[PDB]
Enzyme design. Structure first.
Site, short mmCIF file in Angstrom:
data_model
loop_
_atom_site.label_atom_id
_atom_site.label_comp_id
_atom_site.label_asym_id
_atom_site.label_seq_id
_atom_site.Cartn_x
_atom_site.Cartn_y
_atom_site.Cartn_z
N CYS A 116 12.53 -9.27 23.36
CA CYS A 116 12.22 -8.41 24.58
C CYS A 116 11.34 -7.00 23.69
CB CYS A 116 13.26 -7.85 25.17
SG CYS A 116 14.02 -9.10 26.27
N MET A 117 10.83 -6.23 24.50
CA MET A 117 10.20 -5.18 24.05
C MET A 117 11.17 -4.21 23.20
SD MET A 117 7.69 -2.58 25.97
CE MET A 117 6.77 -3.67 26.81
N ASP A 118 12.28 -4.06 23.52
CA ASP A 118 12.91 -3.04 22.73
C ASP A 118 14.62 -3.64 22.05
OD1 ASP A 118 11.05 -1.05 23.82
OD2 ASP A 118 12.19 -1.64 25.64
N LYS A 120 -3.19 3.05 1.44
CA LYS A 120 -3.67 2.71 2.88
C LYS A 120 -2.50 2.27 3.76
CE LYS A 120 -6.74 -1.31 1.21
NZ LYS A 120 -6.82 -2.44 1.78
N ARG A 131 -7.05 -1.08 -9.36
CA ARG A 131 -6.50 -0.39 -7.84
C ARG A 131 -5.27 -1.40 -7.85
NH1 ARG A 131 -11.68 -1.81 -7.51
NH2 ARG A 131 -11.23 -3.60 -5.97
N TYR A 173 14.37 -13.40 28.97
CA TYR A 173 13.30 -13.84 29.84
C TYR A 173 13.13 -15.00 29.95
CZ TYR A 173 12.34 -8.60 30.23
OH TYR A 173 12.67 -7.37 30.59
N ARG A 187 -17.80 -8.45 2.42
CA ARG A 187 -17.34 -7.27 3.27
C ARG A 187 -17.99 -6.10 3.11
NH1 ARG A 187 -10.80 -5.83 2.35
NH2 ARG A 187 -11.74 -5.10 0.26
N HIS A 231 -14.62 -6.10 -5.56
CA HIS A 231 -13.30 -6.67 -5.05
C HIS A 231 -13.32 -8.09 -5.00
CE1 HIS A 231 -9.32 -6.15 -2.88
NE2 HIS A 231 -9.84 -7.03 -2.28
C1 DCS Z 1 15.38 -2.53 32.29
C2 DCS Z 1 13.84 -2.49 32.49
N1 DCS Z 1 13.17 -2.36 33.67
C3 DCS Z 1 11.90 -2.25 33.94
C4 DCS Z 1 11.35 -2.67 32.95
C5 DCS Z 1 9.65 -2.73 32.98
O1 DCS Z 1 9.47 -3.97 33.94
P1 DCS Z 1 7.93 -4.39 34.04
O2 DCS Z 1 7.02 -3.42 32.35
O3 DCS Z 1 7.83 -6.07 33.65
O4 DCS Z 1 7.07 -3.94 35.46
C6 DCS Z 1 11.90 -2.95 31.51
C7 DCS Z 1 10.80 -3.37 30.57
N2 DCS Z 1 11.53 -4.54 29.49
C8 DCS Z 1 10.71 -5.19 28.89
C9 DCS Z 1 9.44 -5.41 28.78
O5 DCS Z 1 9.11 -6.56 28.06
N3 DCS Z 1 10.32 -6.96 27.63
C10 DCS Z 1 11.29 -6.15 28.21
O6 DCS Z 1 12.42 -6.49 28.06
C11 DCS Z 1 13.19 -2.87 31.33
O7 DCS Z 1 13.60 -2.93 30.19
C1 DCS Z 2 -11.07 -2.53 -2.29
C2 DCS Z 2 -9.57 -2.68 -2.13
N1 DCS Z 2 -8.75 -2.56 -3.35
C3 DCS Z 2 -7.52 -2.77 -3.45
C4 DCS Z 2 -6.62 -3.33 -2.44
C5 DCS Z 2 -5.29 -3.55 -2.46
O1 DCS Z 2 -4.92 -4.84 -3.30
P1 DCS Z 2 -3.62 -5.54 -3.42
O2 DCS Z 2 -3.05 -4.82 -1.75
O3 DCS Z 2 -4.02 -7.16 -3.05
O4 DCS Z 2 -2.79 -5.34 -4.52
C6 DCS Z 2 -7.39 -3.55 -1.12
C7 DCS Z 2 -6.70 -3.93 -0.17
N2 DCS Z 2 -7.65 -4.67 1.00
C8 DCS Z 2 -7.16 -5.83 1.74
C9 DCS Z 2 -5.93 -6.12 2.13
O5 DCS Z 2 -5.80 -7.03 3.02
N3 DCS Z 2 -7.16 -7.23 3.71
C10 DCS Z 2 -7.79 -6.27 2.81
O6 DCS Z 2 -9.18 -6.17 3.17
C11 DCS Z 2 -8.86 -2.90 -1.15
O7 DCS Z 2 -9.68 -3.33 0.04
#
Ligand code: DCS
Ligand code: DCS
Lengths: 382, 380
Positions: B310-312, B38, B218, B264, B135, B165
């Site tokens: 930052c975002m990227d 999953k 599982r 920022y 659940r 589970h």
């Molecule tokens: C160079 C540049 N200009 C403009 C924007 C967008 O400005 P606003 O979404 O605040 O109007 C970004 C988003 N950069 C981001 C967004 O979040 N963190 C960053 O470094 C950006 O990197």
């Molecule tokens: C029914 C069932 N079986 C097996 C698994 C996987 O087992 P493990 O990833 O611990 O080896 C999950 C993951 N269920 C999750 C995982 O996180 N939150 C949930 O509800 C599950 O929902």
């Protein structure tokens, strides 16, 4: 397109049209709007927001890296795209063929790119100046002049723009904003001639000082209807319209008796006879574990998340026996009650920007335009 | 495929193969392994992992909801698939035609599916029993009988299995575990005939108590080489190999002078003569803002992320002036040092499960099998 789980995000594209059109009204008719749709348009759907923005008045688009720009071309966008971040010199060719402008901030990149490219298409460059953000950009006069020369010498390299970016434009106190603006002004004089596009403003800068934007604004966060920071909300010129909402539906309902435990680590214990509802949304959907003490809306009312959050589902205490299939709203309005991205953000202890971005590929996006559904976009769809 | 930004995740399928083959060794010949795949296989890649696990000894797969299963089928997987969560009665016909087994836990569901579906494919159901998790699942006797009865009565409905589970199988303290195990053994008696697949165990109960798992395990988190909890680490029968690593490369390097601000809100101030590098990864990539004080690895050394993420992009304080293009490992090994997913989780104040899962669609996955690059999966 289709989806088979009852969890979806809705994006209201009318809101996006209004936020951008209002800015085209506000700014001087000679100042263009560059809409920034990086990160799949901040988690909202790249091409859908891009098409809408360009309708309301935007003329260019901005993205973070090359793949995002190329993905917009494949989906039919023919508007100019600026890649705000770094790219590989070997890829200069592809960017030029696909009419994607690039950000440049170092001469060694251009030394390296002159050697791998020799037309016929022009590559438009936007020189990036670091005036105080400390991220990317030139910081010296020798280096600014070197880049400009190397660009002037190759016949296919063109300097279309020049920009900078503010670190604190969203703070009420404009002291650092002022140092940066003044520094950009002193840095611009280090260039032989002004290229056609000079830009500096983000959303906080352009909504606050429309007259101080030069000829292009890069509008991001405000396009989606989210304020740049809770420090400038009252300072905003026009009301912003939030576009994103997240919803689910009850898939299981049951009454517990006193003493029964709920979820992982069996944290929660019911103390009277209570109705517990299960929703099919969890942390792999971006509804992170730290939101375990938050709440969702069910039938116009607030209801807490009970126990730990699972990967794909979580439980909530219900007011009483509600039917299976009842809409649950995680982010959005249900009656008089409302949960906004800022609320989620506060609980997550982040900024609003980070919230739609984390709602994952797994969650389908339904687009609305003219108060009717326009398209569904399921990323793990057929 | 290929990608045009220097940020990528690497998935080691050999690690994923060994984690599965060793359980295949540790479990009885009768007992199947259902690999849980999953959430795009916990952020590692659904097809790539499903395939690798089936080669290693797993006979079945499991997914969270119907779209995840149809996605595996569309990519060529023809092995059995159980949807562990809920689905719409109206989609039982699709599940059937695509040979996807469904979880059932409520009688009204069946009643509704019985009206809508007449045939011709059979639909294999797994009855979920709630024994303490709260659940999904059936809890009462007469609700169980009504489900069995509605299944028995329909020509195309088949009860292939049943399961539960465990909420606390990762917990040292086995007291709620033994209450759940006992409750299950008892609920199994409300059924006339014990169906062909009876399963209860997640990774933790299957590696802790392999005999008290009936005929199907599982297997999830441990397949990926991650422990179910820090408490369960020294109680597991074999060493788990870690499959996921995350890398990036320096795209700018600069010497900052004192009193100079970074990112920022200008919350980082340079105090000495520091070399600062910019890497092209940020929060839209799942490298969350809360990792602001964390150490990545550059050239064998820990280096702090300085200023806001930052975002990227984000910035780090470099040991000295390194060349642009230097590999930065955010999760993984660089010579001598290692950052594990457990380390990232510690700082984000979560469980390991959450980490590879938020590393977003934006980040390509490069797959290794037989110690060679097999495939690149770039989502955009
Ligand atoms: C160079 C540049 N200009 C403009 C924007 C967008 O400005 P606003 O979404 O605040 O109007 C970004 C988003 N950069 C981001 C967004 O979040 N963190 C960053 O470094 C950006 O990197
Ligand atoms: C029914 C069932 N079986 C097996 C698994 C996987 O087992 P493990 O990833 O611990 O080896 C999950 C993951 N269920 C999750 C995982 O996180 N939150 C949930 O509800 C599950 O929902």
């Amino acid at each position: 397109n289709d989806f088979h789980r009852d969890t979806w995000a809705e994006v209201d594209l009318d809101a996006i049209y209004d936020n951008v059109e209002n800015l085209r009204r506000l700014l001087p008719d000679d100042t263009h709007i560059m809409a920034v749709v990086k990160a799949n348009a901040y988690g909202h759907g790249d091409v859908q927001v891009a098409r809408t923005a360009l309708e309301a008045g935007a003329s260019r688009l901005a993205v973070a890296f090359l793949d995002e720009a190329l993905a917009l071309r494949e989906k039919g966008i023919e508007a100019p795209i600026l890649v705000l971040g770094a790219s590989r010199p070997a890829d200069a060719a592809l960017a030029a063929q696909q009419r994607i402008a690039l950000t440049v901030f170092r001469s060694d990149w251009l030394e390296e790119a002159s050697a791998l490219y020799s037309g016929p298409f022009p590559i438009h460059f936007h020189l990036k100046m670091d005036t105080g953000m400390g991220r990317l950009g030139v910081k010296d006069e020798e280096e600014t002049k070197r880049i400009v020369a190397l660009i002037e010498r190759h016949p296919h390299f063109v300097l279309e723009g020049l920009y900078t970016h503010f670190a604190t434009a969203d703070e009420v106190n404009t002291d650092y904003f002022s140092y940066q603006y003044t520094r950009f002004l002193h840095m611009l004089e280090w260039l032989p001639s002004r290229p056609p596009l000079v830009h500096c403003a983000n959303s906080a800068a352009s909504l606050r000082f429309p007259d101080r934007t030069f000829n292009m604004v890069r509008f991001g966060i405000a396009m989606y209807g989210l304020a740049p920071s809770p420090g400038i909300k009252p300072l905003l010129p026009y009301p912003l319209k939030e576009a994103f909402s997240l919803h689910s539906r009850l898939v299981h309902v049951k009454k517990l008796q006193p003493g029964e435990k709920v979820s992982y680590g069996a944290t929660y214990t019911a103390q009277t006879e209570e109705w517990i509802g299960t929703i099919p949304i969890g942390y792999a959907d971006g509804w992170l574990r730290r939101l375990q003490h938050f709440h969702v809306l069910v039938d116009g009312q607030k209801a807490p998340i009970v126990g730990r959050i699972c990967m794909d589902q979580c439980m909530i205490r219900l007011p009483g026996p509600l039917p299976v299939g009842t809409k649950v709203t995680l982010i959005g309005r249900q009656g008089d009650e409302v949960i906004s991205i800022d609320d989620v953000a506060r609980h997550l202890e982040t900024i609003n920007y980070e919230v739609p971005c984390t709602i994952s590929y797994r969650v389908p996006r339904i687009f609305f335009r003219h108060k009717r559904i326009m398209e569904v976009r399921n990323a793990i769809g057929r």
